[PDB]
Amino acid sequence: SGIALSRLAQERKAWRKDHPFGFVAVPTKNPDGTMNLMNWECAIPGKKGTPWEGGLFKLRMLFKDDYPSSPPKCKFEPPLFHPNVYPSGTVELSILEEDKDWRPAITIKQILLGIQELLNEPNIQDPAQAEAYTIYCQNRVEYEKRVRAQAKKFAPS
Numbered sequence: 001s002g003i004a005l006s007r008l009a010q011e012r013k014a015w016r017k018d019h020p021f022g023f024v025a026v027p028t029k030n031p032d033g034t035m036n037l038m039n040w041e042c043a044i045p046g047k048k049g050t051p052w053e054g055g056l057f058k059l060r061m062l063f064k065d066d067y068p069s070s071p072p073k074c075k076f077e078p079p080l081f082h083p084n085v086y087p088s089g090t091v092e093l094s095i096l097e098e099d100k101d102w103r104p105a106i107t108i109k110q111i112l113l114g115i116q117e118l119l120n121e122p123n124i125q126d127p128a129q130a131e132a133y134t135i136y137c138q139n140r141v142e143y144e145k146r147v148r149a150q151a152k153k154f155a156p157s
């Protein structure tokens with residue numbers, strides 16, 4: 001885990017120095033209050049001018065011991081209504097796949113901005129959940145209606 005922790009400490013430094021407005025990315029605590037750099041609690045704000053606007057969408061970023069060989073698993077908690085989000089909460093995205101567009105050099109900032117962009121522009125060619133995907137494909141106005149409601153439920157206080 002040395003190589004992974006070295007990189008994850010450099011990502012925490014870069015993120016604290018400068019990150020996009022409204023985004024959260026913080027390592028979790030181990031039982032003994034020590035920092036767990038392999039498991040981050042993140043939040044993505046809905047984009048201004050979209051049906052996601054107003055919402056803050058919490059997500060866990062989970063790193064394997066061979067990071068950055070492998071991308072993190074990115075998991076919305078709770079699971080999101082979105083065509084490219086598995087019922088588990090796992091995000092399906094090409095930059096989050098080792099055998100697709102993942103590159104070791106991709107930053108936490110680039111991952112979170114990538115997921116933000118996915119939220120309002122689903123990929124109709126890599127479905128992840130039957131429920132959201134079918135409504136997206138067959139009934140776009142009802143899809144956008146469910147998204148507006150979701151954005152209201154996850155409005156921050």
